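Lab meeting, action items carried over

1. Structure of the eight-component assembly. Owner: GW. Status: complete.
Input record:
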Amino acid sequence: KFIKYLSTAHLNYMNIAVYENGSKIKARVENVVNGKSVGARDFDSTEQLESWFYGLPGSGLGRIENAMNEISRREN
Amino acid sequence: KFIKYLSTAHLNYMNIAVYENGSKIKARVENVVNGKSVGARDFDSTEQLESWFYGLPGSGLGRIENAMNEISRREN
Amino acid sequence: HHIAQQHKDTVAACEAAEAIAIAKDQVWDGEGYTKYTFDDNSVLIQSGTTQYAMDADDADSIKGYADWLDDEARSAEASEIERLLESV
Amino acid sequence: VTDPEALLLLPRLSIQNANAISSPLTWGFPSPGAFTGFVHALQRRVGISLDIELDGVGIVCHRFEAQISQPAGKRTKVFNLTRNPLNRDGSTAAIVEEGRAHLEVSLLLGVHGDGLDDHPAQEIARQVQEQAGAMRLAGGSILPWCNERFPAPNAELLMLGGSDEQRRKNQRRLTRRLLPGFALVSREALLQQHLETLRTTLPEATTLDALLDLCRINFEPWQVRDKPGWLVPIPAGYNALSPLYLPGEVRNARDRETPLRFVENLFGLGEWLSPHRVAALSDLLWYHHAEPDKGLYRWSTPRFV
Amino acid sequence: QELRQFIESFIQERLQGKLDKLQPDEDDKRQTLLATHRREAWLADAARRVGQLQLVTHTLKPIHPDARGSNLHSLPQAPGQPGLAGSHELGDRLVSDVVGNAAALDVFKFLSLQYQGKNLLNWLTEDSAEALQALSDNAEQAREWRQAFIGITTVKGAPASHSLAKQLYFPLPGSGYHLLAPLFPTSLVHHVHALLREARFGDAAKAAREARSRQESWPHGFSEYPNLAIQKFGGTKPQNISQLNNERRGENWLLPSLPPNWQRQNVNAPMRHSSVFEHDFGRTPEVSRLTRTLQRFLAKTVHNNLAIRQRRAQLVAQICDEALQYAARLRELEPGWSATPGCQLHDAEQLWLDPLRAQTDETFLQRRLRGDWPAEVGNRFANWLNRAVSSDSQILGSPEAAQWSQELSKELTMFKEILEDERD
Amino acid sequence: LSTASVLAFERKLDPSDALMSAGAWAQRDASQEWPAVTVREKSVRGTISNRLKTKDRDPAKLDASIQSPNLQTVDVANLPSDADTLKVRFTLRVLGGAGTPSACNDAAYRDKLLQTVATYVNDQGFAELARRYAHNLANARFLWRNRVGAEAVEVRINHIRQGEVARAWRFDALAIGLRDFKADAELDALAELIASGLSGSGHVLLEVVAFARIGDGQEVFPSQELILDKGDKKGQKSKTLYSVRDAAAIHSQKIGNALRTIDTWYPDEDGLGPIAVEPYGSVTSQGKAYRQPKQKLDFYTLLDNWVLRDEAPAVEQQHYVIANLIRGGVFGE
Amino acid sequence: ELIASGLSGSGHVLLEVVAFARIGDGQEVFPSQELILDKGDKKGQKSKTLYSVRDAAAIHSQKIGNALRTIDTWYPDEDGLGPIAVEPYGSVTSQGKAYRQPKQKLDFYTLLDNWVLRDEAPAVEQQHYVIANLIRGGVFGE
Amino acid sequence: GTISNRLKTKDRDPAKLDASIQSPNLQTVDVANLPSDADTLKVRFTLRVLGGAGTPSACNDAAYRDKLLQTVATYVNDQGFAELARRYAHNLANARFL
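Predicted assembly:
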């Protein structure tokens, strides 16, 4: 079910994990030591994941901070 | 539509152009070689343009540097 | 658990279960629940007339604890069902 | 509402650990009710023994630093709490939330009594300061003297007698020691004016409070609306809903001898100023009057304009 | 008599909600257990357990969670002041919601169907003949249940309080005290926070700030909220503090009440040449903000003279009084004013910003600068105001610069009049 | 005579926030113009070295989690590189009148309480409590971790009546023990000052200044602030430090915790040491609660048995109860 | 003997360490590098900041502290590479590898649990590893 | 800057490379160099050795903490700190911290 981590370096114990559900993938912002997640977002394929992710403003870990601030957004 | 340049000497490719829209004029800070503009400001008549412009602190091209730093101001 | 079986429709002895046992949870959605946690990790779901007495250290009784939920009640409660995914 | 003869001034009272919540809807600098209730506490500890009478208080507010935090780049703020001791059982407790400030404020006062004929000025001001040095000003402690005891001498000024040149002279001698601070008044007539301006659609006043202290961006067919001053929402009294109760009725009162009602606060408009705008410094003190036939309480500075 | 078409139809609809999970061995008892209850006994067992809830509009619990006592629905009067505002201005839109054991809110929604475009709530407190035509039951049933239905909107039966209820004395005009127990205005908090969440984002807010991205705005006006402060109730369990939805997970935030010196600075007058050369300006962002606001009142004619007759007179007082604040901040902070270069043009401003006397000062200090009432810095300050804001000559041909020159005349006159006693 | 449903005691021994400023030893008597210790940021690249479970643990997530570096931003406070002495300054008021509550329902219960406390003071003075308070000001309990591993710690205490100094004390914190309350002439003098303060016989304001040799450019330890950690937005930054206007500082209630470590009268073990005075006398770091209510040594049990029923406990437990009244708090139901 | 007399609590030990290196005239020195994050702002910014104190380049304290505790010559995998520093789940961030796996029985948590709770004393060099982790310090437990 | 990263050659046309090296890779960095008339780096720091390396600062259990102190005290009584201080002395001897 688990595929990979989205970033290669943890920014204060937090990282985005990429999961597989069948015909869709599940990106999920989560703590690493504990395991409990803070927000999630469902995509259809990994091409949508990389195509959406590489369009974010930033480079390196500013991109992963923007992605964690995007997936774990206050929904209301 | 175009009327004149506001200054008679370009300060590092940059100059203020004065345009006409009907019942109003449009001062616009712009590059000269390329053509793309950086900020703009709308006045009602040329008497407001010269009456506002000649009240700026400076003389010669210090006045046109203050005017370019005024029209192309960060609006927020 | 047994207190809602010898008194399965007696809500006065469920108020005695409020008198004896420990702290309480509430669930607000389109429906409405209260949850009575016990010392034996037994959480009584209470809703109007109907109820459910949960038995922990058993994931099948936690499936029965998830048999009393709307999907809006399952829009909440996900940090409570996944909280109980340890007990082996 | 009685005009005082003297204006006692406390120079630099630095609160450690104040209460920066002050209401369920406003946030920052604390209520005027703490600063008036402090004066009535001085009236219950000093004024009956030196035969004087303390009625109002003048907020000056030289310095203010709230223990806040702003992480994650958001444009909102959170608090900086403290710990509590462990559980009743021995694990941990819940977390209530409490505001906090490192305040420094100067306070004008108002004296009515006959103690001036019985005692000189330095005696009166010295007794009042050396009682106020052991109290708690707005829910937090009052910092004692240090190397900055150099402004710590008080002042006292009779207001009625004397020529007008001594009035404006010594008045400007007062306002050169309140010089970096910003005074605070109440300006509800402006709120009635804005009710009469926005009375085309709806005369509601709470939505006017929501539409005064904010940056109104009005676009062009964008122009920021010009603020006519440094206005601020403050709590301004109580508007009791329950009928009054006899003393020995409600369980868990403070004492079983004074009556009770259940109240809610009442929101008003206030304004921070420079002290040189004020015509006479006696028109700055915070009084509070009442009529307990109904639930209508308020703090105010009557006759400011 | 369509109340039987409310009760007897709506309970049947809730039975249709229970048809999704029905087995026949449980339907053998659920036939009479649902139908015989659904006619009469659902209101009996439901009416027996209404007192587990409590419908109030001001709750005591967000003051402290352990506190038990008196919650109040009572908002009978709006007798308030001519200028003061509160939760008496609600009138309509009364969001008053449920405090208590959440297991039995099915009664509450059943009482919510009474005000579905009808005046049957007064027929739920009275009007038993309307319950004789419509409900058509016995007098003990409908009248006893009608007695038992007011008991969710009223108190439990005795006034109470707690030692964590913020009880405060309040002195009277020459009389005793009234100790008062304040509450938390939950309906007002929910209403105002619904307004703030409508204002910060929504349909037209995203549209108009999208027009700020596009520079293509239309008739509309929005706003921005500086310095909202989050206050959180309940802790990790905002459920036990009642009424708090996922929209309000202990999320009551506060409008700011800061004094305008909350953001202090470091006073920029060291012995370096940069501040010593440009010392005549004395600017902050507030000074230049008021100066540019003063410049923006030049294209205002007499056609809208309600604003310019008032705001221009007040608008110049804050600049000179702000300069008094600049000498205030310079005065009691940096007492070190020793010898350095540039003591000829910064010598009149030195006697304007009169520092403390030196410790090595001899007897020739009551004659070196004793007669220094420096009225020349109102002239340099006048030149700084003249070069700062534009002085139009089309207002000089009119009487706008005679009245305007009168305003700067008397305002600089009163400024120097403050400057008359800088030493004496 | 039931208990009062509302009781509240205002605190005495009110400290302030301690300020830290660094300098050089033997420039110690001129410690008045020393610059403050500032709080700064630095980044920290560490590895993940906590405990990791075995349930719902894909080993790809495990080995992917261990083999990757962690990035983080913290706050530190260090001395300047040419200074080896920490200076910690705070003040202390001693109010006095430690029997009168600030809020009480009953009038008979309050008069019985004042007769009990006045009976205690008339039987024996405040000499014991002021002796132990004098020992906690003598050494450097209020230097919590800054004391650990130091060459020499010197404490200077001043008494203030006006813009002057009445009497100055100069101690040595390492010679004075951490666990052994031994008498001394100067500690009896300062204990007479504090005991004269708590009885209401005068006004007592003390200025406490502490000096510690740590090392050139070493690390000082201010008190740490709360990042609330409410669900989302954990943030890049960690370990924020408390401060005043451009100076590191310690909270006032932590010094106030360090002053009231009196209690050597636990039922469990008197071999560990004095830990501070609390009702249900507990230690948050150890996770234990000494002085259980299942025993008869709790503050509420002794106060109820000594006010309402005239059953006077042992003398040292009376020192415990009066120590809780000097602490103050919110009592009653 | 001085450091061993210091760690046993028999005295106070403060050392001053000064290092000298011939590199060359005008060559490049290597201070430690700070954290920046390229987010979405205007006109760009820097890409390499360096740690400093008041107008002097410097190295972080935890990097020197990393350089002091390179003890561990007792890996199960290979003792031919060299000593790399002492960590629970003994890992190298640059190499991307984690020696001393918990699937073996040489982890710090496994040896500490088997040596405190059950009195199963490990080999002597692993005891040097465990006491080295106690001199390192950390946040242990659940 | 320049172009020296790997490419997938799934969106790497031969015109895309020339277009990508028309592109600006302009950049601003920090350097630290010696002065031109100096050839020696000096690195100074201090070091405290505290001691008491068995006592934790926070522990729930009292029996587990006493068992831990008996284990560590058993270790120190069986053999000293000579090995660890020997290896620490070797890391201060050479220049690992450079």
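2. GW to write a short summary for the group page. Key points so far: Strands of chain H lie at 40-49. The longest strand of chain H covers residues 40-49.
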